Ligand binder design. Structure first.
Ligand SMILES: [Ca+2]
Ligand SMILES: [Ca+2]
Ligand SMILES: [Ca+2]
Ligand SMILES: [Ca+2]
Ligand SMILES: [Ca+2]
Lengths: 269, 271, 270, 270, 271
């Protein structure tokens, strides 16, 4: 598809907003531990690793239908171009809480250890599903069958197997520990991610309504929404909550998006 | 309301200043532990979680009345105060530089005591109306004190985004930080700025200077517009946790200073 | 006082340099522990908290006298020295790179000893008058030593902001840092810069170079203006805590160098 | 060779993409622990230090063949491919977000297991010939496996800079990172970028995005020139250490992606 | 000396490169522990702190002779080499990525050993004369090895700033870092750059690239001017501490490379 100039004039710009709730494993809003994974079930050995589905954080994704733009026989057509995005992880302050049931910081007179450890933050804005690459810590892990993971895993999948590809086309089904953004593709999506590992690492997060991210590429072109559909994807693992018993649950937070779009001329394919 | 151009000429600018004391739990200037929470009381179980009001840090809010601008509300165009920029500062930072305070020893009984440390939260906002808030909690089965403003009729959904859990920050020392946070879906007429570092024992990090200004104009060059000539300042500045010798623990907060520059903005009379 | 333009010409610029020694508690050059506080004496209880003067770090402050500018004090306009920029350095940083000093072993008795670490506080200021202070303390029941300048008749309000608790940094080694901080509601005529990192055992981090200048001009392009041709330089550089083998502890401070560039500013006579 | 101007016009630009798999020690894709080292085997003494080849992470290198540019090597000028910019990404970062893997418990046997952490090393390079390396080791009495490429006949001088200990990164998975580092006295025709964080148990930190480009041009506007139409891509990405339940330890590495943009550069025919 | 304009024309620029090996205490290339200090010997008491010379890291320094510039030294103006920019690199950073070296186990005897960590100190300078130094120590009652250069007649004042405690870095591996640091009140003709992170066990952080240049020109656009056609390069790069199985400890350092670009600068002849 040959991309042409930006369409000017009145009504050329639009704005959408949305939020994606986290998918840490308890993914139904009636779940007692909604926003958390179930207690981590640890592998007995390399050969015997069977994580429960509810213990595995997955990517969130939503598809937004935009206003129809196009006569599909005219020489040029228009597409929605995502220009910029304001995005924020919501409910950061809920972590500022030392009375929750948990493990004591010192003895039984102290507060409880707050959520900490490994964090993973990612958002993407694209005109189609985020393209994914498969890679696991262990090729001998047996994943739950109703989740989307790598078929016919071999040791190569502990590194880069160019056959292990997928599209993020379902909310709450693609394990973060299996899939990551494919940098060899995603020509039509901008994605942004940061990771800090560790068992007990302090989480660090910002929040403001003053920051915007521009989505335009080196040529001045943002993601173009095929079939007038905008794709928002995210994961926001903000750490691990430990219970008194010492069992542990991933903690995630929801993400807000506010995307500005304009109208972009393309040559009819 | 349609926003027009900046009003130029003499006396088009004004400047205000204010401080906000922290609301950590002991919120009365006579309280022995003013500027701290009461000893954290830990939930016995998920089902039975009743934090005392005095153990829950809340937001600080102050409303500042600005000079009256409009003589005749029938004119085609009207003026509003526009917040353009703020200098802001957490005060008393060096009060944490203190190893003789009562507490838990760093090593044995010959050493100094462990200074304030652990989870920190800093936020300020400047707005032309109350900061709009979104409700979200660590646990939906916590029972909050009824003399505070918390999410009505909580369900497990409230551990994530429930779009019906919305509030306004309209009272000082009443809205707990562990329940409410700024709503990025609204707040078109406020600017907020926040940072969080967690952990049980993390060292606090803070800066102080009179050389730094934050500009409040949005992408259209328009700052917050003060509805009814009212400027809303909001803040929380939790600088960590102090541990007592008994190992009981208290949140510590510090005051925040504001210096806001404002200018007159023409609007189209909405009636 | 109405500020006018900068004065041009030859000899319109001057430059001064000075150093300020740390005031950690042992403030006399002949003290065995000069540059350190005395062993921290801890409160038995909140109501029983009597920190020795020698255990409390205080601000350093120097007044530099500048060439007189107005031989005739009745002219319709007067000149003032305007502080334009400063290069400043915390000296002797590498003295901390030392694992043999008497103290607490890192591991067992075969290993090096724990270096200076924990809470750091760095501040400098340059003004044409004394730094303006706001008092605020961790505990309003602490009894401070009388030979120091602290908040008069403390009440619980002083654990937060009491607008009556103000002071001027006008004496070297007398204003404790745990009591006073720079007052952001004043200090129109001073530039100050601070950085704090807490913790019991935090690694300190410091840089040193002669390539970096801080510009002191405000948003109207005006620096601090030196009243009575006097320049005020203030500082504190607490670089951490040294722990002794007995587990007693001392604050460790380092000196600060200032190199200040000043120009002649015109002002209308009041 | 004398470097002239950039050749303009249609078809003057190309781009290539490639990925490099990590060489942590288990370097054969059929290895059960591919993408990890074997269990680290520790020296019994300084004199007795024989690390297994499979426990030693090595540099990854690939050579990308570029389209032949010159139809007649007799002309006064010829064309070379010039690497202008690169997008590069460490893939599978999120595979580390895994608390269920067999290993050492964070707390007791009810908790998750400790994830990969400790020393990290990341490096990428784009050049028009092999990366030039300098040898330097932690201990000169270590006996390295003979089928790896290491320093010949080491002496204690090799625990610092011996100007004779030089090599070319011209083999994949053969040059140990603990023996070789990029040589800053050479590599005129390569650009390299590296970052290291040590420590026994440090949390790893990594970013990923498709919005970031690195420009490869030097201060004269010239990027790496590809000799014999070959582009050399080199990397190492050690993300830390995995600890087993037995407390044995394995290095963990991740693959790296490269997307390089090149253009045609005119040179004078030697 | 009055400095005039830059001299143009061909052949007005030159480049040099050099490397400085670390002087950590074992400073002879045939020393078994070259590139390390000897096991730290700790003070028994403040009054008897007698550190062995081989335990004490010192500054590296090299002088580079540049091409001679003035035939006739009776001309009203002369040329000096002016250092304009430097590319510098700490070499061998990846040798630290090594967990099989004899040492202290991370966990038990099945695990790797703890790598180099703790206090780091990085400094480089480029100047047209010796680096000017200021003296300051942790304790004036330490007795330093006589064959090193330290502060003569130390008194307690030397635990802070004594304006008489001055030296020049004119000898390689003789001036202890724990005694001497760059004197910011002098060094008008040298650019130095330093960073320090303390602590016992701190993870070291280091970057390496060939893409970064530091410009050495001052505020008036003048770099270091080379007196008698001599260029002085100085450095220390302590990357932390290696711990042995026994728990004895040794400082670890790495070499530094320099690539400096020089141009010809006109000066007025002082006759
Ligand atoms: Ca591709
Ligand atoms: Ca909205
Ligand atoms: Ca004021
Ligand atoms: Ca060379
Ligand atoms: Ca001087």
């Amino acid at each position: 598809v040959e991309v042409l100039e930006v369409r000017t004039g009145p009504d050329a710009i639009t704005q959408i907003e949305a939020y994606l709730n986290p998918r840490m494993g308890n993914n139904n809003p009636t779940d007692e531990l909604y926003g958390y994974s179930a207690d981590i079930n640890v592998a007995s050995s390399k050969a015997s690793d069977n994580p429960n589905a509810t213990t595995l954080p997955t990517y969130s994704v939503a598809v937004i239908k935009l206003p129809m733009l196009n006569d599909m026989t005219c020489d040029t057509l228009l597409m929605w171009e995502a220009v910029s995005v304001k995005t924020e992880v919501m409910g950061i302050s809920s972590l500022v809480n030392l009375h929750q049931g948990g493990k004591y910081i010192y003895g039984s007179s102290s507060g409880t250890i707050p959520v900490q450890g490994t964090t993973l933050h990612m958002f993407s804005v694209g005109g189609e599903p985020l393209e994914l690459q498969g890679l696991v810590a262990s090729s001998t892990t047996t994943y739950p069958t109703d989740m989307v993971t790598i078929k016919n895993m071999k040791p190569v999948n502990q590194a880069l197997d160019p056959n292990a590809k997928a599209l993020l086309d379902k909310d709450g089904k693609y394990p973060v520990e299996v899939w990551s953004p494919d940098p060899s593709k995603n020509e039509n999506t901008r994605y942004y991610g940061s990771f800090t590992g560790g068992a007990t690492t302090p989480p660090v997060m910002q929040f403001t309504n003053s920051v915007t991210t521009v989505l335009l590429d080196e040529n001045g072109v943002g993601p173009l929404c095929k079939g007038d559909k905008l794709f928002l994807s995210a994961v926001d693992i903000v750490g691990i909550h430990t219970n008194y018993s010492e069992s542990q649950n991933w903690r995630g937070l929801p993400r807000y998006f506010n995307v500005t779009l304009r109208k972009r001329v393309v040559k009819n394919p």
